[PDB]
Amino acid sequence: QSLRSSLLGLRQLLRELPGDEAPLDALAETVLALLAQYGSLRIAGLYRVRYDRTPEPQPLATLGEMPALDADDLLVRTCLERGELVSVRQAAVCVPLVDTDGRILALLAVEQMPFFVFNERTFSLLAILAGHIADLLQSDRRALQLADIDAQRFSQYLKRSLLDARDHGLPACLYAFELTDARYGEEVQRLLEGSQRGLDVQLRLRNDEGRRVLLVLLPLTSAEGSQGYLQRLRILFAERFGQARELESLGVRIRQYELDAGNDRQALGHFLFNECGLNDQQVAI
């Protein structure tokens, strides 16, 4: 998907960043360009938002003939107080960039976009992109948390995918591969690890029965995509192990959870903490 590829591009730029520089500053032009692309924006600005939810007037990046952000514009204030996209529908749109913790990192202020995209469809896409960008900027904070980087990333991406589903009806899939045959477990796990692609993230765990469980989250992925992933995995497994071998004959038990705003609130817990035999110390947020 174009969104996934856009986010992968930005993530890679963030990984290629020298390391000393503040992420929002160094990639401000890119962030604005991305938001401009998806919103068909013509005049807009990107601003840093302080901890107390007040905006920094000095623009990080501008598009078109950008007029200065004044004192307390009603749209800017409502946006930052709600932590949500606000438009003057019914000085066009304000989009906050909010991480999975609810921290407003930045503000997109749009002065001009074509009226034919001044609608809920485009607003939703702007909001989706803003949330994902905000998450990507928070990688400079992992250095002060105890959990392994892979655990922090998995947690963040999972929460974002839960938010995507709840707020925007966007699809994602969780797979749990339970490795029940200890002869094959290590090599099966290594093959699963090597298969990781794009925004997918994995967690390597041991469940309450002492078995290897590899969790894989597939963000922004349709049901057709999630089935495509398994078809690709089966081809890889066939290459690696016998043609006369299936994932299942190597001891792999596959459990799948499709993220959806229809699923009951207790469902993910049942899946991970009962079915997969995991606990809240292993997976949370």
Ligand X SMILES: Nc1nc2c(ncn2[C@@H]2O[C@@H]3COP(=O)(O)O[C@H]4[C@@H](O)[C@H](n5cnc6c(=O)[nH]c(N)nc65)O[C@@H]4COP(=O)(O)O[C@H]3[C@H]2O)c(=O)[nH]1
By CB under 6 A, name the binding residues for ligand X. Answer: 197-198, 200, 218, 221, 225, 228-229, 232
Q: CA-to-CA distance for 38 and 141, rounded, in angstroms? A: 28
Cβ atoms within 10 A of the Cβ of 71, count? Answer: 7
Specify the residue, 134 or 218, whose C-beta has the smaller distance to ligand X.
218
The reply to whether 197 sits in an annotated binding site is yes
Q: CA-to-CA distance for 63 and 36, rounded, in angstroms? A: 8
User: In the complex, what is the shortest distance from the CB of residue 259 to ligand X, in angstroms, rounded to a whole number?
Assistant: 12
Region at 134 (left for phi over 0; alpha for psi -120 to 50; beta for the rest): alpha
Alpha-helix residue ranges (DSSP H) falling in 112-258? 120-137, 149-168, 185-194, 223-240
The reply to whether 200 sits in an annotated binding site is yes
Cβ atoms within 10 A of the Cβ of 224, count? Answer: 9
Specify the residue, 47 or 229, whose C-beta has the smaller distance to ligand X.
229
Specify the residue, 57 or 169, whose C-beta has the smaller distance to ligand X.
169
User: In the complex, what is the shortest distance from the CB of residue 185 to ligand X, in angstroms, rounded to a whole number?
Assistant: 21
Specify the residue, 78 or 256, whose C-beta has the smaller distance to ligand X.
256
Specify the residue, 155 or 221, whose C-beta has the smaller distance to ligand X.
221
The reply to whether 4 sits in an annotated binding site is yes
Measured CA distances, 171 to 8, 90, 166, 189 (Å) = 18, 30, 10, 25
Specify the residue, 123 or 237, whose C-beta has the smaller distance to ligand X.
237
CB 30 within 8 A of CB 60: no
Report the residue number whose CB is nearest to ligand X: 228
The reply to whether 221 sits in an annotated binding site is yes
User: In the complex, what is the shortest distance from the CB of residue 195 to ligand X, in angstroms, rounded to a whole number?
Assistant: 6
Provide CB contacts within 8 A for 42, sequence distance 6+. Answer: 63, 64, 112, 113, 114
Residue numbers after which the chain is interrupted (C to N above 2.5 A) read 90
Residues, the chain: 285
Q: CA-to-CA distance for 150 and 217, rounded, in angstroms? A: 12
Annotated binding site: 1, 4, 197, 200, 221, 232
Annotated binding site for 3',3'-c-di-GMP: 1, 4, 197, 200, 221, 232
